[PDB]
Each structure stands twice: as structure tokens, then as C-alpha cells.
Symmetry: C5
């Protein structure tokens, strides 16, 4: 089984790794019958997107925001606007 | 999809942005049958709630409670202009 | 609609406001369900049971309230006011205000 | 209803109160399934377990007490089990 | 019933106890169908995953990561790779 985010990210289609090593600057959450958007100080902006796994990821990004912990890497779907998160590495 | 709260707000009917840039002064929660009511207010008196003008509603309530507990600044709210307290459609924390 | 705990409290039957401005001194939890909180003055309150108070009290909201009260206890944050039902002993919590 | 842990503990068959006033020294948990346990131990060797949603809640409370170093004041436990099974907890 | 992680680990088949006494250096979570994969790593390269929801264990590891609390021991199926976690002990 894949051992890290780079290996995991290769298993998906239309994805790439963003290496950020930064805390989340802005956290946005909206009712969508919830969409979650995060941005970083350099302006990189990502959205979340299944029920259960998506709630866990939304909780993780929310907690990261409130605690100011560093996001190391994201694996994202690059055919989406903003790009959609497949995996997260905190380190 | 829009990547900021201003444009997201524009996609709902009868909503507006309030720019706050301050921490929640009071957080109130009450039993209301199948759901809890959750009301927040700020130092200038602006009062807002979570209520549809399910799971996502719960998530919003938890975000506002966490914001209250931690004293984190609320940057913006997109709210519906229905009731006072106005219902929250979106939140931005920065 | 009501916009604060005082206005909300008047919508229920058999309630009162309790003015606290204190952190929770004692948190008690039992699985045989019951959550009880107490403050330095001896003021003691319980969380309601699902299906009580004309169905104003139901399982999922109560779980959320239990979460809030436990967080308040652990973090030492002040409870400003409670809206409490007086038809139970200890009085049971309808609403919580944190400030 | 009971107003404290002593009153509630008196309501059940084969329970007893242990007074601790100590922080949790060790927290152990296994995966959901038939072998799922949460086990807590204190400095003096005293060890307890949590044997639906009330069960979830109590496990969460113990885990948070460990993470934070909050003192456990009292436990109401069934002592027809080893480790004794927690019926109620008092934090103070 | 078991009273500690070693006794708990012996209720599983082909498990071992990996002693660590270290904080988690990296936390990775990823979307799969029906559940998220969760992978943790330590500074020495030791890498573990949660799999047989297993939501409680996932919550515990994430909280350990966020708070920097030490993971004392893991009971793992050490035939899996990365090894899958059956139980965790938190101690300092």
C-alpha cells in the first residue's frame, strides 16, 4: 500500500502535488445543499472534493486553520476550480 | 465554483456580506426539538444564527462554537436578510 | 425570532434564567446518558433526556449540548447564563449562554 | 434525579465509588470490533475500562482527560469485572 | 479482560508491539471510496496505517499529531505494509 502522499497522489487521475509548508491563511465554509475553501498567503486556493471521508477531511482542514499547524503538501485534482483536495500531508 | 465568500454570496437569493473582522462576544445555544438553535452576537450588537431560511448545518454550528471558544476573528459572514437574527449562509475566517 | 437567551427562555414552559458568570467546577458523566454540572456556589444542573419537555428535548441536540458543556468544563470558560427548566431536580438545561 | 456521582452510583447493583484525584497516566484503545477496549491506568496501578453513544461519549471524555492532564476526581465502577468497568466519572 | 496493551495485543493474530515513545512526525490523510486512508510516520521512518470506518482510531492518531503527544506503543499487524494498527498506548 502507498506509504506517503507522493505515492498516493500517483494513484489518482488528473492530480498533482502542491508543496506549501505553510499554515492556512483563510478558511471559508458555505452551505451547498457544505463547501470548504482554504487559501494560503501566496494565494494558492483549494476546495474540498464520499460522505464520511469528506467530513473527516473537512474537520482536518478546519482544525489546521484554528491551530495554525503547517500544511506540508496537498494532492489535488487540477481539472477543478478551485483545485479539489484528494489528500493532505501535515508535517 | 467561486473561490471566495463574496462571489459565493452572490449565488444565493436575498443574501448580503457583513464584514466584521472581530471575535464573537456571545455564543448562545438552545434546545429546539429536532435541532439546537445557535445565536452569535458581536460587540456592536450584530446578531446572527444558524438556521435555513442537515449535516452541513451542524458543521456551521461547530465552526461558530469553536470560533467563540478560541477567540478567533470572524472576517466575513454571508447572511440571508430574513429574520433577525439573520441566518448564516457562509463564513470566512482570516 | 428571539435574539438572546432571555428572549428564548420565555418561549419555553416552566423555565427560568440562572445568572452565573462562572466556570464549571464539577463535571459528572454517567453511562448507567446523564451529564451533571456544578459550580462553586453549589448550583447544580443536569442535561435533559431525549423526548422530554413536550419533545423540546431530543437526542441529537442533547448530544451537541453535552459536547458544549464538556468543552466548557475542560477549557475553564465562563458560563454567563443558563435557561433552565424548574420542573426537574436538579433543574435541567434548556439553553446556554457563553460570554 | 441524582445530584452527584455518589447518589447515582448508589442507584446500581454491584457498583462502587473509587476516589482518585489524579490525572490519567496511561490511555490504551483498540479498534472497533468485538475486541474493542478503552483502558485507563493511574500512577498507583489502578486500571479501568469502558466496556452505544453513551459509551462513545465516555471514551471521548477519558481520552480528552488523558490528552489534557485533567484530574479525575471519582469513578463509579462495576467491580464484578477486571479491569473494573466505569459506570460514571467525576472531573473536578 | 486485558489490562494493558500487551494483554490486548495478544487477543489478535499475527500482531506485535512496536515501542516508540515518540511524537508523530507526519500525518497523511487521503480520499478513497467509503473511507479515508490515514498514514502516520515517525522521524525514524517507521510508517503505519489504519485499516482492517475505524473512525475512533483515526481521530486519536490525528489528535496525537496535532498536539505533539507521545505515542508509547502500537500493536500492529506487522505483516501488512505499512503495518496496520490494532491498538495504541499513550503514555508519558
Amino acid at each position: 500500500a502507498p506509504q506517503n502522499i507522493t505515492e498516493l497522489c500517483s494513484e489518482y487521475h488528473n492530480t498533482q502535488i502542491y508543496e506549501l509548508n505553510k499554515e492556512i491563511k483563510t478558511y471559508t465554509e458555505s452551505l451547498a445543499g457544505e463547501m470548504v475553501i482554504i487559501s494560503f498567503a501566496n494565494g494558492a486556493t483549494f476546495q474540498v472534493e464520499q460522505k464520511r471521508p469528506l467530513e473527516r477531511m473537512k474537520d482536518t482542514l478546519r482544525a489546521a486553520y484554528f491551530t495554525g499547524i503547517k500544511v506540508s503538501k496537498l494532492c489535488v485534482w487540477n481539472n477543478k476550480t478551485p483545485n479539489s483536495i484528494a489528500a493532505i500531508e501535515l508535517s
